[PDB]
């Protein structure tokens, strides 16, 4: 797995102050712990449940899981335009409106509602 972020995607991640964070790319079928198709989850430390590194030449610490990698594609590109993050590969568009979520916040709320 490898990925590249366009200039607009990089700028955006920067405006959101998360380009330097631990990023987790996963499918969001409502079943994972980081729910709310794909989304970018950011953390401050690595999550052992998502150990697989997605190679890139932009120094981005981005990960995924063995389960999520089967739905990702070869030579992925993350772009930003029309106000949304979009993920694609050599096979085509994967998701034109990728969401971003604060991982810790997600878990915290998950815990409190319970």
């Amino acid at each position: 797995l490898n990925i590249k972020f366009t200039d607009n995607a990089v700028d955006y991640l920067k405006r959101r102050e998360i380009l330097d964070k631990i990023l987790i790319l996963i499918t969001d079928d409502g079943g994972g712990k980081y729910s709310i198709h794909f989304s970018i989850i950011w953390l401050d430390k690595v999550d052992p449940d998502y150990p697989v590194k997605i190679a890139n030449e932009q120094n981005v610490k981005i990960y995924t899981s063995d389960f999520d990698k089967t739905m990702l594609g070869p030579n992925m590109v993350m772009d930003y335009n029309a106000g949304s993050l979009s993920l694609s590969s050599d096979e085509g568009l994967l998701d034109g409106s990728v969401d971003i979520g604060n991982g810790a916040a997600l878990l915290k709320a998950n815990k409190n509602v319970q």
Side-chain angles (χ1 to χ4, degrees):
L1 302 299
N2 73 280
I3 191 173
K4 187 163 195 178
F5 302 81
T6 67
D7 289 324
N8 294 1
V10 166
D11 282 347
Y12 177 71
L13 297 175
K14 272 173 179 168
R15 298 187 221 105
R16 288 280 269 168
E17 305 296 341
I18 60 159
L19 183 61
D20 65 302
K21 303 288 189 183
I22 298 304
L23 301 179
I24 299 170
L25 173 60
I26 59 170
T27 67
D28 191 348
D29 64 355
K33 61 176 182 183
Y34 294 124
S35 191
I36 74 86
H37 178 58
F38 304 79
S39 53
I40 282 297
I41 305 308
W42 67 266
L43 299 175
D44 280 295
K45 288 188 88 302
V46 296
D47 184 328
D49 280 1
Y50 298 96
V52 187
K53 294 180 175 175
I54 299 178
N56 60 280
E57 321 218 300
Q58 289 165 284
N59 304 291
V60 177
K61 300 174 175 178
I62 177 167
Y63 298 76
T64 195
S65 65
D66 283 311
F67 171 69
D68 291 292
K69 66 180 183 188
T70 49
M71 250 143 291
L72 299 179
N75 301 131
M76 294 178 282
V77 171
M78 187 72 80
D79 186 31
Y80 187 78
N81 62 89
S84 52
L85 268 178
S86 67
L87 178 71
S88 62
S89 67
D90 296 323
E91 317 190 304
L93 180 65
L94 283 157
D95 189 352
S97 46
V98 182
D99 305 309
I100 288 175
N102 176 328
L106 283 167
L107 308 183
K108 185 172 60 187
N110 267 17
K111 178 186 178 184
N112 292 328
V113 66
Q114 281 181 293

